[PDB]
Amino acid sequence: EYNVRTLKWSKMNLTYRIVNYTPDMTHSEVEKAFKKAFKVWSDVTPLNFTRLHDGIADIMISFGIKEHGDFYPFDGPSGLLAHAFPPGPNYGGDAHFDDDETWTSSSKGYNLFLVAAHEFGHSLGLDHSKDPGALMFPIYTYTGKSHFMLPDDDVQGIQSLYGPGD
């Protein structure tokens, strides 16, 4: 397919844009899930994320079905859930979510917040973790917790790129 890589962004302040919304969730729920997903990474780095409402941002977020632009098509219900590109121009940093999945803010289907937090990891330069319990593990696992703690494997990875936070 169409691919972009660099190890990391050369700046600490990044922009994102929610291009379109899944019908499974409300605009407010989708916006909250993505905002928390960026918070996972800005809590432990100097990274900052600013949301844009039009134009082109560093991280363009969109929901698509099957072939959607990059010739890495989705596969319908289940299987591939999402993917994202490493840092760089154009597609670099972008996050794609398969809208053939039922996206929820809870546990009914696939948790948008969890998947997005993982993909934004990739958008920042992270690879997959060899640890099945790390966020960046490629297999989707639902936690069932009323909160999310970013595992240490994921903190060390993102801090090796951008350094620590507060």
Binding site: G79, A84, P138
Partner: peptide, 5 residues
């Protein structure tokens, strides 16, 4: 990349 099942 996230995968289920």
């Amino acid at each position: 990349i996230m995968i289920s099942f």
